[PDB]
Amino acid sequence: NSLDRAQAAKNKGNKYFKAGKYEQAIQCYTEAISLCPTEKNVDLSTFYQNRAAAFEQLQKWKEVAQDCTKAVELNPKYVKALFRRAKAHEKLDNKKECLEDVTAVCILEGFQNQQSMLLADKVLKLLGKEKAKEKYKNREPLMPSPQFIKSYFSSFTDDIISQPYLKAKQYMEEENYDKIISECSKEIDAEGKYMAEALLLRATFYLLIGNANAAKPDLDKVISLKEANVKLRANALIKRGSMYMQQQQPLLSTQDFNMAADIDPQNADVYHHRGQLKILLDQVEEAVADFDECIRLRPESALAQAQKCFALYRQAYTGNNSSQIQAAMKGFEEVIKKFPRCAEGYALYAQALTDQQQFGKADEMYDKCIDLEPDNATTYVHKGLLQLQWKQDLDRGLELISKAIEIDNKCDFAYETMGTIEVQRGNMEKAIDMFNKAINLAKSEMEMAHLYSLCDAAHAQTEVAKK
Amino acid sequence: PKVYPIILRLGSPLSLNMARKTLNSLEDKAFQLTPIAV
């Protein structure tokens, strides 16, 4: 009798649950919970989790939550109760409590079940965006590294701003970068001799600082203004086309990048920045054609030939044709022997080697970059990330990225990387400190929303480690 | 696999943008390959 009456009452719950008679089902589960022989250590957690299932059908999310908590207190590793409690939290907008319960579920399922994984990812994205927008409203307009700004403007050839705003140009060539906005803002409210391009220099430093909302009116004016040099109109459409890609608006981005190639068809910068975008969007065939148009306009360039070779590698590698992949690999050595001082030739080749698991050769190519430019902090980061792939030797991975952070303490890619090493070492408080050092260097909501997903997963595993 | 936004760095070497496109996958495995999870 003692167990049999409770088992019978459970099945009397199940028949009414199958009938959709959910109130009568809840009464039979409540009978089972009242009748249970607790002195026999009966698995009462199952009666509570069964009762909780019916309250989803009634959509009383507080009742399904508290009947799952009863099951979890009796039985702390019971996945059904933890996942049902997570769904109830999501419906109640208890997103943090959902994340902690789903983190325990992912761990106890060995990350195998993709229903749990989808709820984790959704709730992390929502928690990420909520934290991101509140911080991004309050960020510093933090100027990036001088090595970064010189590397940035070295991307634009066919541009009156880069080549030689007239007050502002002095501070570019003297590298007093934090003055530039102020001068452009008084060279506007004047004649088109200054105004028509002071707009676009100002818009460029707003983008570099991550202030994209202030960039968009200075770009929109330069398109609208008819008498301004056609190369400024094309250059402004590269910068609007890029701004729309930070906003993840790919149709509006593509419209501008096409208008640039219609408006100024003999302009390498338009095809260069289109080519680099199309290969990140994985629209590989359009990237190769736009890089080939860079070589046609700049045939002496080492960088343009390195980039077209990487584009043919990515085209072969999004295929599976071994002959084409191997031909592309030899293509980088042909580039290196023609251009033995091309640091981006070695860096792109090292990434083709990294991707083909040729780690020991890839490592030499990263050494060659250090010989050619000791100030290039990101090579110690590409050499550190290689350690995390090259039989995962995490101990020396810290030492490399510590040297990278010592060369350039504004390399957010270095801090974000070392955060993931501290995660693999289980050192979650220092991982969260590394991700916070990366968050203080982000240029967009889209980046902060990604770094806050990492901090919240690190917190959730810290709270699951107690349990 | 998972899918992520195309988080462009502005006017950066293409090798750095392809490296951020990789670090998203090492971040994904970092929380599974840790002592708390094992």
Residue numbers in the entry:
A (entry chain A): 109 to 272, 298 to 600
B (entry chain B): 39 to 76
Task: Please give me the paper's original passages concerning this structure.
Tom70 is one of the major import receptors in the translocase of the outer membrane (TOM) complex that recognizes and mediates the translocation of mitochondrial preproteins from the cytosol into the mitochondria in a chaperone-dependent manner. It contains an N-terminal transmembrane domain and tetratricopeptide repeat (TPR) motifs in its cytosolic segment. The C-terminal TPR motifs recognize the internal mitochondrial targeting signals (MTSs) of preproteins, and the N-terminal TPR clamp domain serves as a docking site for multichaperone complexes that contain preprotein. In line with this, the mitochondrial outer membrane protein Tom70 (encoded by TOMM70) is a high-confidence interactor of ORF9b in both SARS-CoV-1 and SARS-CoV-2 interaction maps, and it acts as a host-dependency factor for SARS-CoV-2.
